[PDB]
Amino acid sequence: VTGDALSASDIKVDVQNLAQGDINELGAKFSSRDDIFSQVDTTLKFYTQNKDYAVNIKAGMTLGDVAQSITDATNGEVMGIVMKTGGNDPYQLMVNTKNTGEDNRVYFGSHLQSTLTNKNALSLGVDGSGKSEVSLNLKGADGNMHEVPIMLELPESASIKQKNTAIQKAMEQALENDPNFKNLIANGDISIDTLHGGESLIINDRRGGNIEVKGSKAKELGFLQTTTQESDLLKSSRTIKEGKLEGVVSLNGQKLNTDAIIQAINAKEGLSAFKNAEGKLVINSKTGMLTIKGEDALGKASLKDLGLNAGMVQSYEASQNTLFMSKNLQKASDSAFTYITRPTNEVNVNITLEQTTEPNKPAIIS
Incomplete structure (x- = not known):
């Protein structure tokens, strides 16, 4: 092997990129x-x-x-x-x-992912009912969900890659042109990346808000799933204990057959609860925040029987801004080279890629 770009265990190897972790x-x-x-x-x-x-x-x-x-x-x-x-x-x-490799990018918060399997033409307009054929529902700068129409008149694509880039542009242009989104795209909270060599788009919101792709033509872009799963705030550690439980407890101040407790909780402003497929109490709050407390010795001692701890719990969404700022320093990426791309530097004639090469001066195994 010539130079320092790879080590093998008359072959010419231009090394354009190395595989990377995130x-x-x-x-x-x-x-x-x-x-x-x-x-x-x-x-x-x-x-x-x-x-x-x-x-x-x-x-x-x-x-x-x-x-x-x-x-x-x-x-x-x-x-x-x-x-x-x-x-x-x-x-x-x-x-x-x-x-290493592209499939290992870390996307914090929420995301929706698409898979284009054709290069057909699409026109993205407005249906006979006056509704966007495709629109993106994201959480805005003001904390409210808003709808961003996505319009696009695109003839047959030469490749799946140019199609997706086009969609990416369309979505990016829309978000940059809307007041509720302009700065979320500028500061990196909302992004739309391409992935799997062009085959896929991924919308990511680092703040974790709901994402939806709606419209009569969502399917045409290839979102298997068109909405992100709002994940529930608090789930008991244990099924609620059977038999007489005693005392008074508080959920954001509000005083209290895990069914009985459920009905009790739902009657309180901005709190909601339900019973899981495992039989467990799941509580939600509008604010994304819960403070559990016992209101008297017996209540203090009964929280464990509801599989709860005295304390404050917060949704990711509610706590992202203080606890979880993220910045990417290096993006996971596939290696790229030519006698061809691969998700690692180990390319098996066994070769490990170690460095890029300069144009017209490649690694020669001989």
Whole structure:
């Protein structure tokens, strides 16, 4: 092998890109690994390797705790690592992938994903009922859901890749042209990336808000799923205990056959509850926030029988802004080269790619 671009175990190899894992900063600066990361229970939501993960975070956890818990939630596929950086509080939480290749980008919050399987022409307009044939429903700068029409008159595409780019542009142009979205696209909270070599689009909202692709023509873009799953705020650890439970407890102040409790909860403004397929109490709040407390000794002692803890719990969405700022430092990406692309640097005639090469001066195995 000539130069320094690869090591093999008369062949000419231009190495354009190397395969990479993802590297992200998540969370604020800390003075110490031991400082408290969050004083509230909450969930860190992200998506990678085609899997949604929800890492539970408990009130009073340390930065060190959260780092490890990311690693433990994912079985080591996503590594929660602490790295010294700059400034007075040096410690910053990093979330880095174990693996290389495009499929390992980490998308925080919510996302919808498409798969185009044809290059047919589409016109995206307005149906005979006056409704957008395709529209994007996202959470706006004001905290309310809004509808962004997506219009597009596109002849047959030469490839699936140029079609998707076009859609991407259309969606990006719409969002940039709407007051409720202009700055969410500028600051990176809302993005629309292409993936799987052009075959797929992914809308991601790092704040975690609902995403919907609506309209008579959503299917034509290839969204199997057209809405993201609003994930529930609080779920008991245990089925509610059988028999006489006693005392008074509060949910955001509001005083109290897990059925009886459900009906009790639903009669309170901005709280909702239901019974799971496992028989468990699930409580929601409009604010994304719950504070559980016992209103008298017996209540204090009965929270465990409802599989609850005295404390505050927050939706990811409710706590994203304070606990979970994210910035990508390096994007997971496939390797790219030519005698061809691949999701790792190990290209098996065995070859490991180590560096890019300069045009007209490639690696020669001989």
